[PDB]
Amino acid sequence: STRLKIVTIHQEPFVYVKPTMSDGTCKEEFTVNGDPVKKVICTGPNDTSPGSPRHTVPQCCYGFCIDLLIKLARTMNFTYEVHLVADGKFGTQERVNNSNKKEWNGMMGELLSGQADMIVAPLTINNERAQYIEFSKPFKYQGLTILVKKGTRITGINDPRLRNPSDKFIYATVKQSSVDIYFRRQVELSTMYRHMEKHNYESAAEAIQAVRDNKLHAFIWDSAVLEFEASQKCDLVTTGELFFRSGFGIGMRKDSPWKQNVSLSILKSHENGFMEDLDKTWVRY
Amino acid sequence: DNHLSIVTLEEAPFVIVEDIDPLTETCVRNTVPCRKFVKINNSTNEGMNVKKCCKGFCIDILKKLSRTVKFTYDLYLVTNGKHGKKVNNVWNGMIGEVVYQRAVMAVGSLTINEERSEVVDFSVPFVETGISVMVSRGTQVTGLSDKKFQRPHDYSPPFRFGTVPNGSTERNIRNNYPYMHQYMTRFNQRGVEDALVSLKTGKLDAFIYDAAVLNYKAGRDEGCKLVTIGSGYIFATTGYGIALQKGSPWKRQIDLALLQFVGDGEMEELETLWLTGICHN
Numbered sequence A: 001s002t003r004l005k006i007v008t009i010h011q012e013p014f015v016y017v018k019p020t021m022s023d024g025t026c027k028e029e030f031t032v033n034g035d036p037v038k039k040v041i042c043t044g045p046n047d048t049s050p051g052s053p054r055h056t057v058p059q060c061c062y063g064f065c066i067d068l069l070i071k072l073a074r075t076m077n078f079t080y081e082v083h084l085v086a087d088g089k090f091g092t093q094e095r096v097n098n099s100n101k102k103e104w105n106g107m108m109g110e111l112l113s114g115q116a117d118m119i120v121a122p123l124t125i126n127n128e129r130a131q132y133i134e135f136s137k138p139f140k141y142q143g144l145t146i147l148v149k150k151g152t153r154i155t156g157i158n159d160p161r162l163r164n165p166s167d168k169f170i171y172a173t174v175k176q177s178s179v180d181i182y183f184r185r186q187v188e189l190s191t192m193y194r195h196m197e198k199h200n201y202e203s204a205a206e207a208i209q210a211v212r213d214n215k216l217h218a219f220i221w222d223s224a225v226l227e228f229e230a231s232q233k234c235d236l237v238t239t240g241e242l243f244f245r246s247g248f249g250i251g252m253r254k255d256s257p258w259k260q261n262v263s264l265s266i267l268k269s270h271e272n273g274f275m276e277d278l279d280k281t282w283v284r285y
Numbered sequence B: 001d002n003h004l005s006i007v008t009l010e011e012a013p014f015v016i017v018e019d020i021d022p023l024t025e026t027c028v029r030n031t032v033p034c035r036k037f038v039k040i041n042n043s044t045n046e047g048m049n050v051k052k053c054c055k056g057f058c059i060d061i062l063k064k065l066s067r068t069v070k071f072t073y074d075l076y077l078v079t080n081g082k083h084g085k086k087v088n089n090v091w092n093g094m095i096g097e098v099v100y101q102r103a104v105m106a107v108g109s110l111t112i113n114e115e116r117s118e119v120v121d122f123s124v125p126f127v128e129t130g131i132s133v134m135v136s137r138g139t140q141v142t143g144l145s146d147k148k149f150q151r152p153h154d155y156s157p158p159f160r161f162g163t164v165p166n167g168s169t170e171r172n173i174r175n176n177y178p179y180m181h182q183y184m185t186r187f188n189q190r191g192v193e194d195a196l197v198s199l200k201t202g203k204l205d206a207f208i209y210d211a212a213v214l215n216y217k218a219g220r221d222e223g224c225k226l227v228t229i230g231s232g233y234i235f236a237t238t239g240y241g242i243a244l245q246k247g248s249p250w251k252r253q254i255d256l257a258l259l260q261f262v263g264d265g266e267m268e269e270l271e272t273l274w275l276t277g278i279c280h281n
């Protein structure tokens, strides 16, 4: 078939996921600035629970990455079907039993096994993944930053209340997340990691609420998300300079005939203001 | 063969050129040899390849790549243009040196854009950049779509804004906003330093230029009076990339090595060493 199988993941504001309405269509929504929200049907599991059947049902997807897909599809003249990654993960290498050989899970695993032809999601470009798949030039540049209550002054990762931690100023990230792994991996962040390990949260929503409830003083997380959170919640701000800059890219297999033109299209969309429009639509307010 | 011709261009703090130490005729400390063709006079095109020394953020990237990817190199400074522009259907600058095979690669403050990617290959980005706007603190500008830029004669007096021509920033403005662009050319700046002086003394209202260089200059500005608009506003976000010849056998290993430097914290070290300033916002 010539229809491309697109795999994505729920991650706001890049991909929202909602149920269809009673007639199986997606609710009409707009922005106050006028434009209808473009929505696509994505099939995927709708029960995350462990050991559960993965009953694939049509759902409604929209957001920065879906707008980007729509544009690429029209510009490059392809059709597509979207589904949500069956195991709910972005993609890490995990060990098999009886073997020290690793296997990718998540969206990476689906792309490599042929269950998808393209990953269209906020997929961090890094060395480990690039050894196995091809990435476009970044469709979104971002990094790590720090979410605090309005009025809290923190210069960034080199602020004294971060570098010399105490329980008078608690900071933390999400357990087992890409940020936690980054803080573990880097030896020079050892005293900060020791502090964070005492305080890390189970989810970003929980960390973000704790910042609101003055139980967590600073939450360290991906800047794209935190800028979106600051945009809706006027009591919370980001603070300090970005660090550990990174980019999100479209993912394709090594042999893909789409890779060159997908990347040129992303460059074109940055240069002509399309990407800025997506930023103001989905990441600001 | 693993000995490579590589081209660069001075632009602090990414590439900084020093004279060689006259007593030793060697490049020491954090510097590497780099040659520059210099004319004898204006009548003939006879010249000398002058031995100089280079350092900076992009030079440290080169040193790391040379070590990790295992090549040696002969580094030279381009003298035919600057970063790269297509003139009468012929690329000049760093891009041109790669297209016409005088250099295996170009290392410097070289912006990735679509038209350059048609004639060279780019590595993954190793510095985030794009287009920013520098003003004297207090001056109000929303971004590139600000009406004062897009329809400049709708204001009396019109807003005074310019760029340094012939790079990726001018090319983007020319392609996107024809009226803006033709208006701006009377405010063309010969270089970044001229523009900063013009801003600070109020002869210019805004300077539109590469985001990475403007963020660096804002960070060291005397009195922290020149700022980039917005919350680090960047239009047409992109990166500096290493330019290689189409189909280069070096691209894959250069890409993986750059991405490894990110993962191992090496990129954070180069930021601290070269890109930190005392001003913030």
Ligand SMILES: CC[C@@H](Nc1nnc(SCC(=O)NCC2CCCCC2)s1)c1ccccc1
Residues within 6 Å of the ligand: A141, A244, A245, A246, A247, B125, B126, B127, B128, B129, B211, B212, B213, B215, B216, B219, B239, B262, B267, B268, B271, B275, B276
């Ligand atoms: C203009 C804003 C800012 N741009 C920067 N880009 N990179 C750094 S640190 C070096 C680094 O992390 N490279 C890896 C990134 C590169 C991009 C894709 C992900 C991997 S700052 C800047 C520049 C100059 C002075 C002050 C701020």
Ligand SMILES: O=C(O)c1cc(O)c2c(Cl)cc(Cl)cc2n1
Residues within 6 Å of the ligand: A011, A012, A014, A090, A091, A122, A123, A124, A177, A178, A222, A224, A225
């Ligand atoms: O492994 C990943 O690609 C990854 C991992 C993450 O945790 C991400 C988060 Cl929180 C937000 C966003 Cl926008 C992208 C993310 N990507």
Ligand SMILES: N[C@@H](CCC(=O)O)C(=O)O
Residues within 6 Å of the ligand: B083, B084, B109, B110, B111, B112, B164, B166, B167, B168, B169, B170, B209, B210, B211
């Ligand atoms: N870095 C730019 C030059 C400066 C600019 O035009 O912003 C380039 O590669 O053309």
